[PDB]
Amino acid sequence: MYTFVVRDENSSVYAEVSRLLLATGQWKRLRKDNPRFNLMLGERNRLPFGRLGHEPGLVQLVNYYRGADKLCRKASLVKLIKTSPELSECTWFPESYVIYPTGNVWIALISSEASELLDFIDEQGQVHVIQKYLEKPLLLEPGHRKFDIRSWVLVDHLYNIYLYREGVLRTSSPYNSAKTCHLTYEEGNEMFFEEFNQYLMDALNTTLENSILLQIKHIIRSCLMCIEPAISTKHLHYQSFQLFGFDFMVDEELKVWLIEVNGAPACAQKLYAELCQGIVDVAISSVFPTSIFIKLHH
Amino acid sequence: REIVHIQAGQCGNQIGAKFWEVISDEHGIDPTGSYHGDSDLQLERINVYYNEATGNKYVPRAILVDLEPGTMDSVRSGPFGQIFRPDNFVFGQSGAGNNWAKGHYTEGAELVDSVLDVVRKESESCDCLQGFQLTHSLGGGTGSGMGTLLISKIREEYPDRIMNTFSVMPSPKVSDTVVEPYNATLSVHQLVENTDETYCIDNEALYDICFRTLKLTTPTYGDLNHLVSATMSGVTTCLRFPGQLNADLRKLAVNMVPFPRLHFFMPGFAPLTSRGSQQYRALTVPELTQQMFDSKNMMAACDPRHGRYLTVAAIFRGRMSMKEVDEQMLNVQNKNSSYFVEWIPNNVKTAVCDIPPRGLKMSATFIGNSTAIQELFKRISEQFTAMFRRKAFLHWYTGEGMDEMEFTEAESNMNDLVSEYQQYQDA
Amino acid sequence: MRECISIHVGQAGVQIGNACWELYCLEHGIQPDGQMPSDKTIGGGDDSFNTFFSETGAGKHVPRAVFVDLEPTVIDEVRTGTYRQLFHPEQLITGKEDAANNYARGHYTIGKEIIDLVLDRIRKLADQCTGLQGFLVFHSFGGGTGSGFTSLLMERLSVDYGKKSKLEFSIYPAPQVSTAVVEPYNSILTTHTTLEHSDCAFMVDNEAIYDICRRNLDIERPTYTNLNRLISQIVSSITASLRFDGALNVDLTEFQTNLVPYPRIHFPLATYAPVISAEKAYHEQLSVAEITNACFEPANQMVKCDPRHGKYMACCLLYRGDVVPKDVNAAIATIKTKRSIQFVDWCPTGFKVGINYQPPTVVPGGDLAKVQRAVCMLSNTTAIAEAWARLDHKFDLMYAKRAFVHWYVGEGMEEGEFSEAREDMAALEKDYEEVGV
Amino acid sequence: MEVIELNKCTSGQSFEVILKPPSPSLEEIQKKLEAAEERRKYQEAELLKHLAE
Numbered sequence A: 001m002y003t004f005v006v007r008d009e010n011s012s013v014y015a016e017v018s019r020l021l022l023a024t025g026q027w028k029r030l031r032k033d034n035p036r037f038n039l040m041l042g043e044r045n046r047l048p049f050g051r052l053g054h055e056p057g058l059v060q061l062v063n064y065y066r067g068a069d070k071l072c073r074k075a076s077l078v079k080l081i082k083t084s085p086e087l088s089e090c091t092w093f094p095e096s097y098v099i100y101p102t103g104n105v106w107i108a109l110i111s112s113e114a115s116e117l118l119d120f121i122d123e124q125g126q127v128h129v130i131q132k133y134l135e136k137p138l139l140l141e142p143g144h145r146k147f148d149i150r151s152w153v154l155v156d157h158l159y160n161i162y163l164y165r166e167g168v169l170r171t172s173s174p175y176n177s178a179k180t181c182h183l184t185y186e187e188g189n190e191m192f193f194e195e196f197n198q199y200l201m202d203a204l205n206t207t208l209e210n211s212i213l214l215q216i217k218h219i220i221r222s223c224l225m226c227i228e229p230a231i232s233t234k235h236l237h238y239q240s241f242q243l244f245g246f247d248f249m250v251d252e253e254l255k256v257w258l259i260e261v262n263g264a265p266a267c268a269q270k271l272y273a274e275l276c277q278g279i280v281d282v283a284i285s286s287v288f289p290t291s292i293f294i295k296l297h298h
Numbered sequence B: 001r002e003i004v005h006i007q008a009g010q011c012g013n014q015i016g017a018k019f020w021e022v023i024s025d026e027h028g029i030d031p032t033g034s035y036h037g038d039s040d041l042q043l044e045r046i047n048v049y050y051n052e053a054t055g056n057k058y059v060p061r062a063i064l065v066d067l068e069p070g071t072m073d074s075v076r077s078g079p080f081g082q083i084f085r086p087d088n089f090v091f092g093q094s095g096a097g098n099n100w101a102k103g104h105y106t107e108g109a110e111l112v113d114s115v116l117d118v119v120r121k122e123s124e125s126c127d128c129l130q131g132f133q134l135t136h137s138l139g140g141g142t143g144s145g146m147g148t149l150l151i152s153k154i155r156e157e158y159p160d161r162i163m164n165t166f167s168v169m170p171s172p173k174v175s176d177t178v179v180e181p182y183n184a185t186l187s188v189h190q191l192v193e194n195t196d197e198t199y200c201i202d203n204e205a206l207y208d209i210c211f212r213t214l215k216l217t218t219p220t221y222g223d224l225n226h227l228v229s230a231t232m233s234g235v236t237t238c239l240r241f242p243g244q245l246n247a248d249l250r251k252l253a254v255n256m257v258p259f260p261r262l263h264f265f266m267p268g269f270a271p272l273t274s275r276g277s278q279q280y281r282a283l284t285v286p287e288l289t290q291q292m293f294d295s296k297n298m299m300a301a302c303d304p305r306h307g308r309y310l311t312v313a314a315i316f317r318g319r320m321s322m323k324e325v326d327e328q329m330l331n332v333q334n335k336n337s338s339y340f341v342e343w344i345p346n347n348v349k350t351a352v353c354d355i356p357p358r359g360l361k362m363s364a365t366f367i368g369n370s371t372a373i374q375e376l377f378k379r380i381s382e383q384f385t386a387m388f389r390r391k392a393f394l395h396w397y398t399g400e401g402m403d404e405m406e407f408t409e410a411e412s413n414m415n416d417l418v419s420e421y422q423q424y425q426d427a
Numbered sequence C: 001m002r003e004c005i006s007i008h009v010g011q012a013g014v015q016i017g018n019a020c021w022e023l024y025c026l027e028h029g030i031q032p033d034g035q036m037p038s039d040k041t042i043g044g045g046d047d048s049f050n051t052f053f054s055e056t057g058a059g060k061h062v063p064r065a066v067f068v069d070l071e072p073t074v075i076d077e078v079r080t081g082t083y084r085q086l087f088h089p090e091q092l093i094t095g096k097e098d099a100a101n102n103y104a105r106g107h108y109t110i111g112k113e114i115i116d117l118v119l120d121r122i123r124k125l126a127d128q129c130t131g132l133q134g135f136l137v138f139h140s141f142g143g144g145t146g147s148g149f150t151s152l153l154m155e156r157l158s159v160d161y162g163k164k165s166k167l168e169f170s171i172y173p174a175p176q177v178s179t180a181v182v183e184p185y186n187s188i189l190t191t192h193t194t195l196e197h198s199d200c201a202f203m204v205d206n207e208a209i210y211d212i213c214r215r216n217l218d219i220e221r222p223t224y225t226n227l228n229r230l231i232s233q234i235v236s237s238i239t240a241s242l243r244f245d246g247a248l249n250v251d252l253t254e255f256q257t258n259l260v261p262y263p264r265i266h267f268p269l270a271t272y273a274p275v276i277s278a279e280k281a282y283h284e285q286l287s288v289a290e291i292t293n294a295c296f297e298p299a300n301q302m303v304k305c306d307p308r309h310g311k312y313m314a315c316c317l318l319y320r321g322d323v324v325p326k327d328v329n330a331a332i333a334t335i336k337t338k339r340s341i342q343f344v345d346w347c348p349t350g351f352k353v354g355i356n357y358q359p360p361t362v363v364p365g366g367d368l369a370k371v372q373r374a375v376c377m378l379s380n381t382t383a384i385a386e387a388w389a390r391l392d393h394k395f396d397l398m399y400a401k402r403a404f405v406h407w408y409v410g411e412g413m414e415e416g417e418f419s420e421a422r423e424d425m426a427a428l429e430k431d432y433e434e435v436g437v
Numbered sequence D: 001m002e003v004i005e006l007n008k009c010t011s012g013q014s015f016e017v018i019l020k021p022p023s024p025s026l027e028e029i030q031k032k033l034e035a036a037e038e039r040r041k042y043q044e045a046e047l048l049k050h051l052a053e
Ligand SMILES: Nc1nc2c(ncn2[C@@H]2O[C@H](COP(=O)(O)OP(=O)(O)OP(=O)(O)O)[C@@H](O)[C@H]2O)c(=O)[nH]1
Pocket: C009, C010, C011, C012, C013, C015, C016, C069, C070, C098, C099, C100, C101, C102, C106, C139, C140, C141, C142, C143, C144, C145, C146, C147, C171, C173, C174, C177, C178, C179, C180, C183, C206, C224, C227, C228, C231
């Protein structure tokens, strides 16, 4: 009858995961500050990795990968994608420049005039990064509209990368080369992979698999394999998994571009119970005892 | 590192005498004081409780005290009645009449320096005197009153040694006199101020344990003291036998008491055995673990789940996989992690000894400093006011020269003790 | 040639010092009566082993050791043991009553009364050494004498031998084998006081050594006797450079300038491999790239931490056995690629290497197998602070309630030394963090 | 990768590899020791005072 604590009350996702765990009749919750836990649904920043995996006769698991921040911080992602040789100087990341406060359209916040950019960041005081705006993106008809793709990606304790096969798009109900209808028909301003694949078929003569998801899988696989040695917990004294949200942009002729990696993602409402289930089957009980995932083999 | 043992009054001296029979058999010392022993684990630390004697005899470092002669007479007529140093039967003739004031203030005073002088003789011929371990009951007059007086005097002469007592809480289920809650509260007031550690051996619990668990219909003091020596032999295990711990009273005091007043322990024993009948399957380490922490194996009338464990000592006697004990003891804490305070980390330390007690191939003693013990003092302190708010039976004491105000301090101090035990049950 | 004095304090120190001296005597061929047939310089010599041994006119090789314990229990087993003749009687010192797991008891109460005796016993060894380098101090954080007396002694050496180096082998407390509930108290008080008086201190977290014993030695419930024999194995390669002819780490002061660039951050991380069992028959012999690689697996370190999430400041590699610099370099080059080896910029990203050909020595009938080649990596990585975090937390949970403080104040200590000592620790954790991000 | 300082010996060798370059006196002691023994002799003498009452 495994035990678990809860230390991130704002987590949209693990809310469900903590819920379900109790209702299995075999998981119990202790208070925040009890050390005797098998599972840590941890806080977002300063999650105390240095203190885990130390309680004798207690296998401990946490829902964060130490060092994942390399892939999920705007300034820090470009560092990874440009320095580490596995991510070459790569054909699916928008050109980025990091900058410290102390056709040529760009975004941080967007304009073709450079100095609009520099004045913008230095008048804030923190470090941002600027990146070519996708001038010719794929406008979903009818509407000549902009959208983005977020696939959620779950990484288990033994670094199996599982792609959630439910995706979602955020749409932008009239793109023009003039914060209006450029930064993200379908209820919720959200379209789901079945409908988009359907539209993909009738408008373009293609499908979601061949035209988008191939390269999304080539990205989601390429990024998590790069940082795999820095964050692996294969021989560690505690163990980690982490649900991720990769944010993708598909340009005019079906080119998938990775944009953000959100390491504390919230899931679309439609899929919550489904997604939060596979989390428990895949990343929780696979330690403490068809599939809705695509194992991305490496 | 010699301990010095004192037993006071009828109760002190009956259970006291059992402890010396029980540990003498474990250490292989017969009623003549000779060692016919198998292993030398029996002899490595025999000097803690026994003075080595001429012709290589072993004598208990034990002083017998009482105000009525006669209990010690029976002792001097029991099997291990001759093992005791004859001089160490310090006693008077008046009796103390189940009255705290008589034994503490008037009767006890007449004869107290005489016990102190014996104590002194024993302190010389100590290499490193640890401290004193006293047995006594809290609801009479000689053990409760003369005992608490004697404790107070030893702390004055030996201010820097450990003071350890085995006190028998009074319960109406095995009772002598309606005045018992007066003596217990007056004694608990002393016990708070001048002992480092006292094992609350509750007669209510001993009673119920016999009645229900041991399924005994009419339990005697004979049957209560069997449980008492089994517990007492269990708790002394690490002081008497060699092992990884090499435990001593001052260490036990340090690790067991987070706060000086909260130094009253709930002892446990498992398996609960009934005098005479042995049952022939020895427990399995998982069996001892559950029973020892179960309220039904507690020698105090508090169920531990109404409080939290400040700290815990566990001692397993027998031949068993310490790997398995390590696991089973880990399991109990992790399975019930809420009932141990978080703010004293890893507060359940375990010890293990090859030598088991007599009869049992596998036994487990339990020592817990739980916030539940306030339950016991709540019980005593209600029985108390039931009478005091009517000043019932106070003449028996007021006559001996005591004041109403003295009772109000004792009651007031004791109720503060329950308040303090409550504070850490919420932290 | 320059002599060193080892000092073993409390049960932990004494029992690990026994563990070492036994292994030293096997390594140097000195039998338990102190006769060393190989020594032709009978009664003297400026030889390498004379760093740890002095010779008698009778040709005895005598440890430059001193064992102190506030109870006569442990040093008595030394006094009657297989190596009794090794140590002259004045080297072994016992009290009558230990510090009862109380830093304040061993430091202030019982410590003011034996401190003068010990320092004269120590002064004796110095008067027989032609140039004293410094002291190798063995103790445990959790003990009362382990912690209280050591830090009273560390202060006095800094006064009576100020111009000498003071190295430390400390047993960081962990609860499988812990015997006391206040060890986090004893730990912070003793660290706060010693920090200024020690030049380099190697922490052996007992939790680590225990799992190494269970897993790689197939030892169900490892004993102290299991732990210490593994520890001195680590302790031997770490000090082998002083006892043996060599070119890297030839005196105590070089330890300070190889491993410790800033003074307060002087806790190098030891990682040793291969710990192969004596029972296991038909064992594949591990290559220089295999064992050197193992130095970077967390499950071979003495403190469980993740150097990937830290910065390096220094790194030595001490091989022992059949090892040639060629193989060392190939292994390093390829290990550089496959691992997360991050130094601080103000430090070079290099590896100081030593090779001693005398292959590892193992006690006959011990648990460690005999191996052809061994390595011990000593790395000052900022990730060792994980240990100071965990320790400091346990300290905060209890102290917040003041649990057990009365046992300390009653010895004369004031609640203030607790917060003042924790303040230091909080400062130390911040140094580690500023240097590591 | 550059080697340096390589020394040799019948016992073994040593060397260094670089992957890349950079970018209370005895009186004050006895005093605080005494302050602690006084605080004990007080607390004790105060214990003996309350006993005498
Ligand atoms: N590795 C190892 N650790 C030990 C050994 N002996 C004791 N320890 C550790 O030391 C801690 C307690 O400190 P001790 O050294 O035993 O106590 P002490 O130094 O004798 O000081 P006192 O409190 O007076 O007894 C325990 O938590 C043990 O983990 C040993 O032989 N080997």
